[PDB]
Paper text:
Several proteins from plant pathogenesis-related family 10 (PR10) are highly abundant in the latex of opium poppy and have recently been shown to play diverse and important roles in the biosynthesis of benzylisoquinoline alkaloids (BIAs). PR10-10 has been proposed to act as a noncatalytic BIA binding protein.
To decouple ligand binding from disulfide-bond formation, each of the two highly conserved cysteine residues (Cys59 and Cys155) in PR10-10 was replaced with serine using site-directed mutagenesis. Data processing confirms that these crystals show C2221 space-group symmetry, and structure determination and refinement reveal a closed cap-loop conformation similar to the structures of PR10-10 with bound BIA ligands. However, the higher quality of the electron density in this region allowed the modeling of the whole cap loop in PR10-10-Cys59Ser with a bound unknown ligand. Our new crystal structures, from which the full cap loop is modeled, reveal that the side chain of Glu35 points into the BIA binding pocket after the C-terminal end of the α1 helix. The key cap-loop residues Glu35 and Val36, which contribute to the BIA binding pocket in the holo form, are shifted ∼4 Å into the BIA binding pocket in PR10-10-Cys59Ser compared with wild-type holo PR10-10, thereby decreasing the size of the pocket. Structural alignments showed that the smaller BIA binding pocket in PR10-10-Cys59Ser does not provide sufficient space for papaverine binding, specifically the position of main and side chain of Val36.
Author numbering:
A (entry chain A), B (entry chain A): 8 to 114, 117 to 157
Write the structure that this text describes.
Amino acid sequence: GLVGKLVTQLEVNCDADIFYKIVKHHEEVPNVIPHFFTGVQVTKGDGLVSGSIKEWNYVLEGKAMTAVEETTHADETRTLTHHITEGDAMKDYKKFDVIVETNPKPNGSVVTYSIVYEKINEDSPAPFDYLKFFHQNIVDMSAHICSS
Amino acid sequence: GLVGKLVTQLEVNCDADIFYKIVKHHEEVPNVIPHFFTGVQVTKGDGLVSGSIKEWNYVLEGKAMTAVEETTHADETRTLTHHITEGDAMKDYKKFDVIVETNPKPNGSVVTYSIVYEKINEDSPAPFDYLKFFHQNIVDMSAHICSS
């Protein structure tokens, strides 16, 4: 009950490496949803950007919220990670991390969004509201991509 | 968007084989939720029960629904499978299967409920309502188990 993971996995008709590069450089929130962020980019030492630290302001199921999150990526495994350190979600969770992976189908690709969480206590909900939000956002992004 | 999988994974403080035997023989719906089933048991040939075929009547998010499902199990892998063939969910999904796995932590156990689905069309929702229902049901079951 206290430690868990929620996952939404979707099949997309796109090469895994190409789709990963699309997800990596696209804002995961459509413009119709109220949101913006401020923050910084993170570099690795050679001066190239390797990630970001952002304070998001967004509206989820009608309620305005804030989150501070550090994003990192691993190109070799086509994995993006968002590590939330502060904000409304931290009233419910001791830990809240969002992991986005893209892999070729064993046969297009499979995209997996995982929310790895630890609740503050048993009265805390599991993050189904966030899972649906991330799901609908990635479906919206994928609906605007097509072949050729 | 059309083919996907939703997962809820929970850590439980229980031996994996013991917990699997508890899940295997317990009604996955608490009595406070309106529900009942009719149906049959399935045998493998030696006369021992290996599964069931049930017609469930239940109320989900206030709406009365029906499902026909065949349950099978694999003791060796501590896996239970519910294969839905008919009912309200089939108005939204061409395929709807619920897979419940229990495994020892690499360190208790990890219980995974997966809903493997294929939508009829793009207007169909993903089964977040079912994921939350199964999640809360397994949390309720686990809350009534303790050590010793």
